[PDB]
Amino acid sequence: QNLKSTDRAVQQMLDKAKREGIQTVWDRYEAMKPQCGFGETGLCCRHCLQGPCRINPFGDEPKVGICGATAEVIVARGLDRSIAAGAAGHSGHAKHLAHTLKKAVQGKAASYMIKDRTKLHSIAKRLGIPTEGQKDEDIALEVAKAALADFHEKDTPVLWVTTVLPPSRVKVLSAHGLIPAGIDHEIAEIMHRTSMGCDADAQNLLLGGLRCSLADLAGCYMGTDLADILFGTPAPVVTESNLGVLKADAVNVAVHGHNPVLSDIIVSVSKEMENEARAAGATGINVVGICCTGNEVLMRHGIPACTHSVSQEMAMITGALDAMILDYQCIQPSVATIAECTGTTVITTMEMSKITGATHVNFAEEAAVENAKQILRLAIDTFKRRKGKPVEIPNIKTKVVAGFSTEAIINALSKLNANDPLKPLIDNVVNGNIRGVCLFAGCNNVKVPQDQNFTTIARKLLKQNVLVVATGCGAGALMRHGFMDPANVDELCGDGLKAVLTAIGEANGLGGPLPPVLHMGSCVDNSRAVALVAALANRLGVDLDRLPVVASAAEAMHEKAVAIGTWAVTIGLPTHIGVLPPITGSLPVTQILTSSVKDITGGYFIVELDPETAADKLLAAINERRAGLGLPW
Amino acid sequence: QNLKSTDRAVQQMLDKAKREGIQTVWDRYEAMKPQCGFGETGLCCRHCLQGPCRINPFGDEPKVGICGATAEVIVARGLDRSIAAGAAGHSGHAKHLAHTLKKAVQGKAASYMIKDRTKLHSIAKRLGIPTEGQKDEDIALEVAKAALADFHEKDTPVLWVTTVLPPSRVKVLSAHGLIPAGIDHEIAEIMHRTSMGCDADAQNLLLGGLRCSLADLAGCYMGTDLADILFGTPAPVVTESNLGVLKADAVNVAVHGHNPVLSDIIVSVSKEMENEARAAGATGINVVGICCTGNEVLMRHGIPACTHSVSQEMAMITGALDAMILDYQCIQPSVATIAECTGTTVITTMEMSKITGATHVNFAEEAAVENAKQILRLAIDTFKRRKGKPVEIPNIKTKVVAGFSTEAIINALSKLNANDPLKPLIDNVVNGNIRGVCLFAGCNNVKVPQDQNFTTIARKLLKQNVLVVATGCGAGALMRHGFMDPANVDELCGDGLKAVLTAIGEANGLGGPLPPVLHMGSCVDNSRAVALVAALANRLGVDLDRLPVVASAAEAMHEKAVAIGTWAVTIGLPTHIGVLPPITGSLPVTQILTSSVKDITGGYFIVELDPETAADKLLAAINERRAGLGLPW
Ligand code: SF4
Ligand code: SF4
Ligand SMILES: [Fe+3]
Ligand SMILES: [Fe+3]
Ligand SMILES: [Fe+3]
Ligand SMILES: [Fe+3]
Ligand SMILES: [Fe+3]
Ligand SMILES: [Fe+3]
Ligand SMILES: [Fe+3]
Ligand SMILES: [Fe+3]
């Protein structure tokens, strides 16, 4: 079971599902091989009823789509559509948060409120929204209206793009017409231009896709900002991760998905429902996290991460998972089917995200508490049915220090320098103690043994004094293998990095160093690493395509991840992706994305499937940026 | 060449392309067989990097996607995405027209203006925009701002849905949450919910898709209204169609695509460029039409339709086609490749729709004339290169009477009854002289011998006294076979229909009958047939799902067509489609779309690939609606 997952709890539960006869994602993957060469290479198109059209990667006819579409065009249209669908997911989540905020500050959802006034003021001022003499509800109402405004055309471009990148980057992007005019506008225009009989030039297509990926960036940044206003800016926390955070003698309730609007209230209501949890023989309600909603409650409240991504079903396999509460995105629909064998109540809540088989509780921000209890009651109900029956929880769990928002990191650096908090980080970059910065992002993928690319690449980079920050299921993969535990700095980190992590730690009231990897939150919280990197650029007066920053979607899978990789390339970063995107059917497009895009944005894609090789190329790019600053490496 | 096209000019040019060695769409289709069963049935999914996932239609594993997605879900997600991409095309076109209007009435594009004040006033009042005491530029500015507003969320739903259907239909749709909140909002939400890990229930998905198809309806209706304000409401015209409208001794310039913003100005500038056309040995500039832009200039100015859809390349094969001026949608990118053999200047103009190989002229509404000349000069330039060299134009052309907007039709009926213009049409329905109304819509498809389903089904329906109206390439297929020629009423139409077409004709100052098919315009002008059908419903006080109206996408192909079929079902119509949509891999979804949807909207899909069988089922549905009114049949 090692070619499936490098996670030991996951291997134990895989053995269980094998003997109990429950189909897993790896099983469905095994029944899918050998996969379609056309699909994998991108040479498949079904945008009209004359198709499907396939193009042979190598050989005789068909050399071209029925309508005449070349391989360059088929590949670039497919990729543009994945960028747009990612942008739709991130943007829908942030749009929901903006409606939540407007409802709140107009007295419509008393379960919600402004929990971070500093953040709201810094945002409203980033946007040129007047603060002084204006009351908070009016300020937040303005901020929310602006968020909603960024989804359509208007007098200004998308503010959550133009006001969050260094103006030099904004100028570089505006010269090539890359600035989104509206988030949903860009999504619709992608769907227009990639449909049959429209755009038929690969450069033109890919430029459209770069623009749409900045629309996605805006969705991420909006979601981060709005969720921080609404639920508090993450600050460092200590919790634990892996399946061992589940307890047999408690009501175990998993928050799973991406949108914290629901699950943060779940977290807060669960505490008061203890009185009722006891009357069923439970120590209480044990709220754990799966995927990105889980990372959100782990960043804000120290909620332990139970599992992530490709191994989410393994949670239910323990037999101790009483309630799985979904919102949307990255939920394997198999959980519904699986719940009949493991005894779990699987509950959907968002009306555009139901799974056939599941129970649906219609959540709305206005009646939050009334539904939260309704769900948790059901959770305790299921704990009745499984009282005194054999659970198998692998006793595997790790110590996780997380909650490193960009604000937390700037506060952490301030204790070394109160009026120039970025100065110490810059100094240790300049003298080699930090070789560069690498952001691990994205999901697990069934094609890659779970966490293998993440942990391998992280191992080389840490041993090379690269500051590593991580989000979403990247942060999940690293924390489940010890990389968010300060006690592992010694083994993992090279001497200089060790020194800096130690200096900051001892200077922040601990006598111990920061974790070896900085957990920065969920998928939209990739925006946080932009905020930091932008700040870095600004404090040094250069564009991002000169900083020794890189990014790695080491085991990418979802369309969100493609949009994210593309907007890391678009804001200047060298961007590795550890699974094939479907571009290898076109050398011109591959060449545009790994090279000639260098000439437009300074970023570029690094396609490398071997994790050791990928760490080498990532260090090579970091070191090239060093050499461009005149820096030693 | 008869299994390719039932059009005789097209067969002549197919023989030419065969001997000259030019690859055609039928050739690329031949090199694509046998096509992918997975694709054709809808059991293929590539929404994430773990795919591609295929599901065997019948047999052993794979029975399910890697993530767990059942076949019901894969099919409904694919179909939702095609609905959304259609909606994106229609909505982008209308959004462009709304920007054109705002620019015009703010003194920004003097090449454009209000050419129909009656239409603008009737629209502004349909929307509750105040007219009296307000000047026209302010009224149109308000109308345009409202159009732009319907693309995003706001205080009201999409006005170009709620104010154009009978309120009973609006209530029926609002009860099931089917009313769009924003056009691009619905598109984005479709892309969100159909991506991996989100909506996983087929009914929930298909309801989302119904809503998105009404967003597409709104795009069509907006485009029709704005283009009518801007360029005039079509009134009956006489012109000709088929390749024989090309002339060897003139500069032949084809307007091709969907968006008339450019090509209407092309039409108007071409007349004055005669002085320059003569100085090259040309009788002038011979502007013809291809596809829907062509239908727009055929409805408004009597521009002859040269060809349509699957046979567009055949135009260039004559050797007489000097300039092909594209905007976007339904342009086979092969034309670029083909232009090097036929000597045609292929010119793209829209910046999100370029074909590698073509010349791009950057059009903008503000400098319209300056670019139009630039393009036409090039056209005349090419007429120099081909002076005194062998063209083969098939001398095949037909007489076309068209320009039957809903206003033109209501005016035509008024001469029988001035104060109750719909009364005579209703009376002849009620007494059997009109059995029902059938709208032919959509494109040609390479899988069907060109025009065969259209002409066969039209033949049965006309012989059964069914009023037939037609749009886009449906209207193209019928007019190229004589169905828009009054001289064919005798042969085609049954006695009662003949009588009504004759009465209206003789009463409209001709002594001859209306054509056998009412040409109502382009793809967005499907909206016109809604306006009529709605008016009919209103004049009778019933919902559309009780009128003997049906619709037929007899040879559908593009994603636009799927969105259109779905919103004909959603507004109540029985809707035949003469090519397989990719739904047959799921009986539950097929059943939802051909039956259980009856219980939600009153419409339903009729999947029938045999055109005679389809005419039978279309008559059966018309006659069932008759029986529901208590009517004889
Ligand atoms: S758009 Fe072109 S390549 Fe794609 S399915 Fe249709 S005919 Fe084939
Ligand atoms: S979303 Fe599911 S079915 Fe579609 S490609 Fe990904 S794993 Fe396969
Ligand atoms: Fe995840
Ligand atoms: Fe995630
Ligand atoms: Fe993910
Ligand atoms: Fe993610
Ligand atoms: Fe067409
Ligand atoms: Fe058309
Ligand atoms: Fe078409
Ligand atoms: Fe069309």
From Swiss-Prot, chains A, B:
What is reported on the regulation of this protein's activity? Inactivated by O(2).
Q: Does the keyword Cell membrane apply?
A: yes
Q: Which reaction does it catalyse?
A: CO + 2 oxidized [2Fe-2S]-[ferredoxin] + H2O = 2 reduced [2Fe-2S]-[ferredoxin] + CO2 + 2 H(+)
Against SUPFAM superfamilies, the record matches this protein to:
Prismane protein-like
Q: Name one GO cellular component term.
A: cytoplasm
For activity, the cofactor(s) needed are:
[4Fe-4S] cluster; [Ni-4Fe-5S] cluster
**Keywords in UniProt for this one?**
4Fe-4S, Cell membrane, Cytoplasm, Iron, Iron-sulfur, Membrane, Metal-binding, Nickel, Oxidoreductase
Question: Any idea which GO molecular function terms this record carries?
Answer: 4 iron, 4 sulfur cluster binding; anaerobic carbon-monoxide dehydrogenase activity; hydroxylamine reductase activity; nickel cation binding; peroxidase activity
EC category? oxidoreductase
Which free-text remark accompanies the cofactor? Binds 3 [4Fe-4S] clusters per homodimer. Binds 2 [Ni-4Fe-5S] clusters per homodimer.
> Where, in this chain's numbering, is [Ni-4Fe-5S] cluster bound?
258, 292, 330, 443, 473, 523
Where's it found, cell-wise?
Cytoplasm; Cell membrane
Q: Where does [4Fe-4S] cluster 1 bind?
A: 36, 44
What is the recorded membrane topology of this protein?
Peripheral membrane protein
- What Gene Ontology biological process does one annotation of this record name? response to hydrogen peroxide
Q: Detail which positions bind [4Fe-4S] cluster 2.
A: 45, 48, 53, 67
Q: Name one Pfam family in it.
A: Prismane
Identify the EC number(s): 1.2.7.4
At the top level of its lineage, which domain of life is listed? Bacteria
General function of this protein? CODH oxidizes carbon monoxide coupled, via CooF, to the reduction of a hydrogen cation by a hydrogenase (possibly CooH).
Known partners and oligomeric status = Homodimer.
Q: Which family does it belong to?
A: Belongs to the Ni-containing carbon monoxide dehydrogenase family.
Q: What is known of its domains?
A: Cluster B is an all-cysteinyl-liganded 4Fe-4S cluster; cluster C is a mixed Ni-Fe-S cluster which is the active site of CO oxidation. Cluster D is also an all-cysteinyl-liganded 4Fe-4S cluster that bridges the two subunits of the CODH dimer.
Query: What name goes with this protein?
Result: Carbon monoxide dehydrogenase 2
List the taxonomic lineage. Answer: Bacteria, Bacillati, Bacillota, Clostridia, Thermoanaerobacterales
